Structures are given as C-alpha cells and as structure tokens.
Design a protein around this nucleic acid. Structure first.
Ligand code: CA
Ligand code: CA
Ligand code: CA
Ligand code: CA
Ligand code: CA
Ligand code: CA
Lengths: 354, 341, 341, 359
DNA sequence: ATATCCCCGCACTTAAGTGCG
DNA sequence: ATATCCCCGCACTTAAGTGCG
C-alpha cells in the first residue's frame, strides 16, 4: 500500500504535458512546500488523501489520476471522509473487505480486539507511573489485568477486564486532581462518561473527541472503514474502528488534561452550564484544550529508526493494522512505540525540599 | 430534477464568499459560455455532468457541492462515466453487511439477480409496444425466454439469457430508427457494447452513463455498496451493483433517445468523428441528450399511492432492495411500477 | 376555568394557619407584587401556573392545594411544561379530552383550522398595508384566498390556499428587502424554510421560535396539549397546536424583522456560517432579534374593553379556544383583535 | 433502584450553585437529621418520598430533579399518595391516542382489562404457594376465578371476580400473620371508621403507594395516559391506568409486608395512634417499609434472556402494553415473567450457602 | 443564573440520548 | 480560520433533517 498525503493551503494538481504536477499546500509562515512530478508510465501511488484547507484540482489532473488507477480521497476538517473518486479496477477495496472478513471471524476479531486493550493497559501504567510528582499511594496493577486479558474468550470478557482496571485507574488519577474540581466519578449512574456535569470529565470528554478526530483522519488516510471495529461492536452512527484506535492513545489526552490542571490554566469562565445541567466548554476553554492536545500530540517519539510525532505514529499503527488484515504484515502490536518522561526538571524536586 | 452540463475548455467552479460560482467552458463560435451563481442552501440541481476537456475546480467547490448533496460526475471523450463524487456513505453498516451476506449465499444471490433481468425483459417489451406507430414487426416474445430465466441455475447462465434476448431486442428496435442513422445493433467485432460507431449508439452510450450516475446516487442514498452487485461478476472496484440496478431502468434511456429521433432534434452538426472511425457527441448533441434524459426521467408514474416521477421511483426501488435485504421488506419485485401508453 | 398565573422572582406559597398565602414573583425593579390569601372554605382557583425562575413552596401549601383540588403546573423558560401536580377528582383534564375529541371529528376540526388561517391572511394584509412607506407595488389580495378558504373541504386543501398567498406575501416583502441582504426565496428546494443560508430567513426562523415559545407558554397556561393541533397534523416531536397558534401572530415577527432592517442594526458579526453552510445567529445578533420581538410583542392593543399586550392577547385567544372546545363558549374568532398603526 | 425518604418537620430542598441540597426533617429524640448533597448529572436515586409534616422546596430544586429524571412523591399523613412530580410526557401522542382508541372500543377494552386481573390471580397464587411453610389452612382457588373471568361480558363484572378472589386471598393471607398484629380483612380506604387501620393493613397501604408511584413513572416514560385505565373507570383526574398496572405487581408489596412480618423487624415504636382509633406509620416504620419495598423490587427474575430486576420488569411490561396498543406488538401478557418459590430455608444454612457459592 | 435558528405530511434516516443488563 | 463535549451492547426514544408528493 502506497499513498500520498496532502495538507495545507494551495494544494495544486495540474498536468504540464503528460507529466502530472502536484504541489502540497504550505502551512508554515509562507515557505517552500513539497512538489511532485509523475510519469505516465511509473506512478506507484495507489491513492491520494487530501486533508486540505484550500486547493485547486484541474479537470485533466483528475482524469489522468483515474486513467492511472489512483484513488483521490478528500477528507473533511473533522477527519471524516468528504468524498472519494475510486478508479475502476483498484486493489484498494481489498483493505475494507479484509477488515470485514476479520470482523466476521470470531478467532480473528478477538485477537485484534485483545491487541488494542493490551496496549491501553501499558499506556495506562505509563500514565500513573509518571505520577511521581503525585506519589501519595498512586499504586497500579497492570499484570493482574494482562493475565486475565490473555485468557478472555468473548469480546465482552475483554470489556470486563478493560473496565475493572479502568475503575482502579480513575481512582489513582483522581489523587492528582485538587478537591475543588469535584471529579466525583468518571461515569454516570448508567456507567457512561457522556453528559459531563464536572470540569475534568468535560475536559476529558472534549479531549477524547479531538483524539477520535485524529483516529478518523488516520483510518480514512489508510483505506479502512471507521464504522467496523474489532473490539467495539458496529451499530448505527458508531465510528467503532475509531473507538478501538483511541484505546492505545487515550493516554495523550489524560496527560494534556493533567498538564492543564497542573498549571491551573482552567478558570470557571472557561465553562458553561446547559439547561439540562451539563457542563459544556466556553470557546476559551475549548481552545485551551485543543492547544495542549496538539502540543502533547506533536511531541516526537523514537519508533522504527525515525523520531516522529504521535499523530504520525497513529497513522503508522492504523497503516500496520491495515497491512495485517491484507497479510502484508504477519505481526500486529499497538504496545510499540512506548511512552515515558524523566522528573520534570531537577528544579521541581530541589525546590520542594524546603 | 435538474442536471448541470459542463463542456468545452476552461470550465471553472470556485467559491466566492459562500456562493458557488460555476463558469461553463468555451466551445461555441461566438455564443459565450454560460455562467452560474448559487447561494448557500439554495441549489436545485440534482447533479453536475462534466463532459469538458479543460477545467479547474476548487476544493471548497467540491466541499460546497458535497455538503449541498450535489453529485459531480466526470465522463471521458466517448461519454462513459470516468468517476463520480458522491457524499459520504451511510453510518449504518448493517445494510452493506446484509447485502454481502446475501451475495455470500449462492442461492439468495441467484434469486436477487434474476429479479433485475425479470424486470429488464418486461420493460424491453413495454417500449416496443409503445413503438406501435411503426408496426412492421413490433411483436416481442418475452415468455419463452422468461421461462428460460425462471429455470437457470447460475449467474453466468442469467448473462446467457440476458444477451440472447438483448440481440433479439435491438433486431426489432432497428425498425424505429431510419436507415440513414446506420444502426445495425449494439454488439462489437468480438462481443462488446463499448467503442461508439453508430450515431444512435453514441446517443445511447451517453444515456446509459447519465442513468448509471443516478443509480450510484440512489445506491449511496440508501446505504448499499455500489461495488457488490448480485448479477454482475464485474471487476473489484467496478460499480457492479449500479450495473445491476441499471437493467430495470434502462428502458428510460431508450425512450429518451427515441423522443429525439422522430422529434428531428438531431444533426451531424453535433457529432465529431474519431480518427479511429468512431463517433462522439459534440457539446450541442450532449446537451440535447442530458435535457431529454431529464424530461423522460421526470415523467410521473402511478406507483403505490402517489403519482411519482421515474427519478424518485429509482430511489424507492433501491430502498426496497435494501429493506428486502434487512428483512424489513419480505418480497422483492423490480416490475412492481410499470410503464404505460 | 379560573387560573392563577404566577411569574417573576421570589414566588411564595405558604400556609399561615389554616389559610393559603400566595406571594407572586416580582420581575419589576422593586415595585410591589400581588399577594393572595385564601380561606379553606372558599377557593375558586382551578389551577396555579408557575412560570417562575425563583420561588419557594412549602409542603403544607402543596398539600393544602392538592386537598382543595387546585392543580399546580410549573412551566420551564422555553414555555414548555416542566411538571404538574394534578389533584385527584379535578374537572381540569376535560379541556385536553375536548381538544383531543374535536381533532378526532372531521368537520369539527376543519372548522377550527379555518379560523387560524383566516386570521393569518388578515394580519398578512395589515403588514403589507403598513409597508406604505415602501409603496412600489406592495399590493396584496386577501378576498380571493378568503373566499377560496370558506369552501376547502380538506386540511390539505386549506394549506393549498395558505401557500399561494404566502408566496405572493414574500414577493411584497422582498419589495422591502435591500439587495445587500440576499433573499432568493422564503422556501428551499424541498419547499421548507428550515436551515437558512441567508440573513432575513435566519432572522425569521429565530424570530418565529420566539413566537413558538410564546404559544407554548400560553397553551400550557390554559391547559391544552401543545402537540394536538387542528390545522397541523400530529407527528412525533411536533408542537402542532403551537404551530397553529403561531399563524394569527406571525405578523409580530415579520414586523420585528422589518423594524430591524429599517434601523440597519444588523451588522455582519451578528451571523455565523456553519460547516453545512447554514447561517445562524451569534449571541450579539440573537439579542437584537429577542429585544425587537419583545418590544413588538409588548405593544398594547385595545381588546374586549381593556388595552392589553399582544402576549396577553395570545393567552386570551387560547383561553377562547379552550372555552370553545368545552362548549363554555359557542363563537370563536382569531381575527378579532385587529392590528393598526 | 433507590428511594429517598423524608419525614418529620423541617424538610428542605434547595440548589446551591448547581448542587442539589437535601435536609431531612426533625424527629429523632436527640439524633441529628440526614443531609444530602448532589452534584449535577451525578444523582443515583430514582424517587423522592415526602412523608414529612412540615418543610419547603424551591422551584430551582423542583426543576433540578425534573431535569435529572427524579420523581418527587408526596403522601398524606396516613400513607396514601397525595401527588407525584414526574418529568414531562412523551411527544409521541400516537401512543396516547392508540390507548384512547382501544378504550373507546368495548371488546378491545375488555380484553386488555381482563389481562391485568388475569396476571394478578397467578401472582396471588405464587405468594400463597410460597406461604406453604405456614401450611395450616392456607389453600387457594385461582382456576375457578380464572374461568369466571373468561365468561364476564362487562368491566364491572371483572371488578366483582377481582374482589371475590381478593376476599378469599386475604382470608388465606391472614393465616401467615400472627393473631397479635390483629389482621382481619382489607377494604382499601372505603368507610374510614373505628379500627379500619390494622397495624399491617396500614403497612400494605404504604407499600401500595410506593408501588403506585413506580407505575406512574413507568407509564409517564412509555408515553401512556395514567388517567385512562381499561379495568378501572374512577374519577377524571384519577390515575386509573396506574391502578390497572398496579394489579400485576401488587404481589411485590404483599411479599414485602409478609417479609417484615416474618422478620418481626416491625415494632410498636414505629406507630402513632389516631383519634378515630386508626393506625399510622412513624418515620422508623416508613423507613422499614420503603427499604423492604426497594429490596423486594431489586430482586431479579429471568425474563426474555436477561435476569432483570422487578423495577425494570414493571417498565418492560408498560412498554409491552404501549407496543401492543400501537400494534407494534401482537400479543399482550402480564402473566410472564412468573414469580418463583425457590428459597425454602430453615436449619438448612449449610446448603443454602453452598447454592450461591458454587453456581 | 445563560438559551429559543421550519412547521405542508408522509415515511423514512441520522445522531443524540436512555434504562437497563 | 471555524468548529470537535462517550463509546460496554441492546433496544429502544427523541429531535433533527430529508426526498419527495
Ligand atoms: Ca431535484
Ligand atoms: Ca438530490
Ligand atoms: Ca434505578
Ligand atoms: Ca428509573
Ligand atoms: Ca426547527
Ligand atoms: Ca458524544
């Protein structure tokens, strides 16, 4: 599988005499962005993905593309797919179908489902292990979970282990949240996180949507169906595959949230309260979260030789998952790359000793 | 139901402020290209047909059409569908999964496939009976072939009967079109319905493409998969299901083409010749077929309760297929709405 | 049917030894609100309507009320009923059943439906008349629609007449809208006004909802179901009765919309375009529409002897509907409080 | 399933900022009243039960509860339900009209009515077949009464066989209650005279008001009209449909009263006496009944796969009634789920422990 | 402690919500 | 520049939106 990913302002696609020309849109303070010239006898690209602001596609260039069996997919701002021009005869749909056979296969489904929650538990320990500055009894038990996880028979049995562990995690996380916040519990009387009335749960709920957004962008940038999950069961209006992909990356929003609390960026004027008593975010607060999420997300990580951003790593993993379905990879692992950060400067410790 | 046809060189679709600007291409001698300006939430056009050579459409334009649920189809030189840009697929994946399960089941699949061709045969005759004003041999026997369809054991066997009748159909269809139009049949030098040649064949090729487009829009609209058709054992990424659904509606194209033959609207003035000795509709010709297809598609037919347009009848027929697949409907029949005098 | 309508800040219900004390809320800038004291041996009130924000109720007062067959319904900010404490053995429900029954009877229903549309047509003239400063061809005819109405033997048939008229109304209204605004039509490609793309339509949509609220507040205040209408057919989540009651008072919104246009008060940062290309109001904008509707609604009008505000006219008119439906009144006319300037 | 009971003088419900604050009334000799604080979109309690003499509620508090789907019930000094505060009704009036349309039709109305009493009989039998440890003279009909019920051509005729069996049922039920409690017959509230308030007949009325409250919530939730019952005719503003839906679940109360009696948890300290020589429940008493009703209602029953609680089952049944009316469902039946008699315990603590601990 | 963004009907779909298990 | 306010499944409801007649 080989795709060209196009971002920024000014995505141009035209044909200067049989040679297809592609200008990736710039996002920087107006500099020189990547240019591409394709031969009508060598093009390897199986598809083009456009998560772009502005851009001009010339008619001849769309035609050339179709004639060369290049799919053109246009993503919308939210990572959700806007439209796609699929050429006749394209091994591209193999990916969506491999995914569907796998979902329909008990043995397979389970294995992939397990491969998502396995990672969640690792990243969950990493979060709470990093609570070294909030060391008052933050004790976490991951192998306990993991062992049960290796032996689970059903998909629900997974949710069981996922959940049991989750509850314990939230109790520990809460030890880092000041009393004033009123982080009562992560879930309502119906065991749902939805419709938050407290700040932290509102922060986390908005945080997670931004993560889901990336998962949507990543998935669609890879040729899979967002609606068919392995751990999460498909149902109308449920972006199930995204909900799966979120599980190995939730740690990023949990960190961002904690980072905001840590500083105290959160003010009361950042929130609003619905006629239904829910606590929504005022734009000021909505920004404070996008900005930190983007920062935590644009941190780089050492993986597969290169040092790359977390956002690229989500794409990398879903690309991996996709290949695994095709059999263009015989090993799947959302546990790698791992996460960690040493003591928040020698200052925080040396100053505290007073 | 309106379509917007774009042809010539230098076609443009840009967004100014929030309004969709559409500039038609250059093609006429001194008669200037048509200009269009569409306000947000105020667009009547069902689709867009791009038959033009040069053009430059903006990303925001594609977004503006998609959000306004306006299909953007692109053809090529001959008049066949190259690609279509349709709005995002349904969030209910049970529909697609039902469709697949039915295709998976060898027998279920065989039952659905026959239901398309069953209808195609009924409408093939219906037209030949309307063509009563040109009586020399308009008598069509479906019954003996329709009985052969009732008893076929494979999808390949269905394509065997499909063709047998298809040949006998155009053998009796010729009688309607004058000798001067040089139409023998639709078959190639080997076995194909692709490569232009005959003046009405070029008119038909374009017609079937306009119909294909509505078929995809309707397929999409319900939540089915354009690529997994029951009858057609076509290419992986080929619109097999649209090719399937084409069959019970194909008669609409045939009639629209006829509604120009005795109407004297056609002339050599709108048909450029290929260097390979084939035929291509010029913008002037293409416009006459896009408009005729549009009138013939907007003809009202008394269906269940309401006297509905043939356009809307496609939408309801594919929805029925989708409802049948999900057992929300327990009987499937593409013959149910029939054509009249 | 005698109700106690409470509203404002600091509503109070307490029992000062055997007697019920009701201290109405004060919305006014420290101006004496009404106080009520009832003996247990005499209370004519059938129900209390609390359209309050703040206030206090004691257990003794709630208990006293229930033990004296006095209903207590609390309305939420949007006009919708929040909860009602209905005493057993209370006539009160007779209203809803009369309304439910009148909708059920064919001719009975069409008789009420007609009266709603009759009044609309009249006020529709009253606006276009008032638009005398913008005299160029603002001519509108009611008498053809009024007489066609007299004999429409169907609910659908009523709508047909309402339609033709509204279409000509928005042509004359467009004769008062500056070019700078954009006002293609008042309806979309599916003949609906929902999801506006332009300014005026957005203002109208938002305006009409403020009227919808007003109708709900009144409807619930008089003890009728907001979902069962005579002209508007009940369908899930449709406030059909409010949609009916909106028609004789929509003129107030159209007035607020003209008033706003005249001032030029509407700046660009009052509107916001969505991802689906709809035009919605910013808080800044919404207030301007809210305040204008508020002033136009609070305009006093001499009715049945005492000059009363339009909001109170709405209440009085549903009061009339309730009484008509329950034989407590034989004649009904929504035209009655006519508009003038 | 949780019920917040408030008693005595000086009950208080107010909203500080966004939090609901509850203060219970004064009654305990020296022991301070209970205080509750609820965070927005974080309240687990299903209903409030005000049984307190004095106290006050703010509109913001009333609103807060409505918006958190918390039912607020008020009872008279003798346990009967004065009023309940439910969230607003369904916007699908199709279900209410489907109900009205059934009510209008005689053959239709009768069929529905009969089905309520039909179930009640089967549950009356279960209760009694459970009161089989107290075998002395307990013996019940049901089948003869079920046959009379089939024959009846009027709604009034049903109400006859309802009571004719109820009479026999209560004479039988009396064999489970000790002579000291002084339980004779029932007779609802009808003719409120001397001693028409037996110490346990009293407890039954309370339970029945809590059950009434539940049915009213379930009705409200499935968009039916509480004021249009098939079996019962009653006053215009009477919760006729609640009284109907009460019938197939009345057993839950009977069972709770019986449990409290067999426990002997009930003590003279939980009752004040009336000037017309009647009996009323004190706060301790009310608390006891509310808790044992909650316990009884939270007991599970296997129903269509899932092992669902009775509180849910009531809800499931009203929805089935609602789907039946709108023709969204073909068969109506309150007989299913059936109540089981699988808890026969004595000095058999050795195996009663090994039943749940093994499976 | 602030909101309200159609109103022809039919017969749907979609995306929020929901009351449990 | 402008958004993003869960994510156990089931089996619902509600509110919004839609493709016609
Ligand atoms: Ca159209
Ligand atoms: Ca369309
Ligand atoms: Ca509960
Ligand atoms: Ca409940
Ligand atoms: Ca609306
Ligand atoms: Ca959500």
């Amino acid at each position: 599988m080989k795709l060209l990913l196009l971002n920024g302002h000014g995505i141009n696609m035209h044909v200067d005499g049989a040679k297809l020309h592609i200008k990736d849109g710039r996002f920087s303070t107006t500099e020189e962005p990547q240019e591409y010239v394709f031969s009508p006898k060598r093009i390897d690209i199986d598809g083009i993905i456009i998560y772009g602001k502005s851009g001009n596609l010339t008619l001849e260039a769309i035609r050339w593309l179709i004639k060369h069996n290049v799919q053109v997919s246009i993503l919308d701002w939210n990572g959700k797919l806007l439209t796609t021009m699929l050429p006749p005869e394209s091994t591209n749909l193999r990916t969506k179908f491999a995914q569907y056979h796998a979902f329909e296969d008990k043995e397979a489904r389970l294995e992939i489902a397990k491969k998502f929650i396995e990672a969640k538990f690792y990243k969950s320990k990493a979060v709470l292990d990093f609570l070294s500055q909030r060391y008052p009894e933050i004790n976490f038990d991951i192998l306990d979970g993991l062992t049960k996880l290796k032996d689970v028979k059903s998909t629900r049995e997974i949710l069981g282990v996922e959940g049991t562990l989750a509850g314990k995690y939230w109790i520990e996380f809460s030890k880092a949240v000041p009393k004033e916040y009123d982080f009562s519990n992560r879930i309502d009387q119906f065991r749902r996180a939805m419709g938050s009335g407290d700040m932290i749960n509102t922060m986390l709920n908005y945080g997670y949507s931004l993560l889901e957004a990336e998962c949507l962008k990543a998935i669609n940038s890879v040729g899979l169906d967002t609606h068919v999950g392995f751990l999460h069961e498909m149902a109308p209006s449920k972006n199930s595959l995204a909900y799966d992909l979120q599980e190995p990356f939730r740690f990023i929003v949990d960190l961002a949230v904690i980072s905001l609390i840590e500083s105290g960026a959160m003010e009361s004027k950042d929130f609003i309260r619905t006629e239904n008593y829910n606590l929504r975010l005022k734009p000021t607060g909505a920004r404070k979260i996008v900005n930190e999420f983007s920062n935590t997300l644009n941190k780089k990580v050492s993986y597969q030789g290169k040092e790359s951003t977390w956002s690229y790593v989500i794409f990398l993993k879903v690309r991996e998952l996709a290949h695994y379905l095709t059999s263009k990879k015989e090993k799947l692992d959302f546990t790698k790359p791992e996460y960690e950060i040493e003591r928040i400067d020698s200052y925080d410790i040396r100053q505290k000793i007073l």
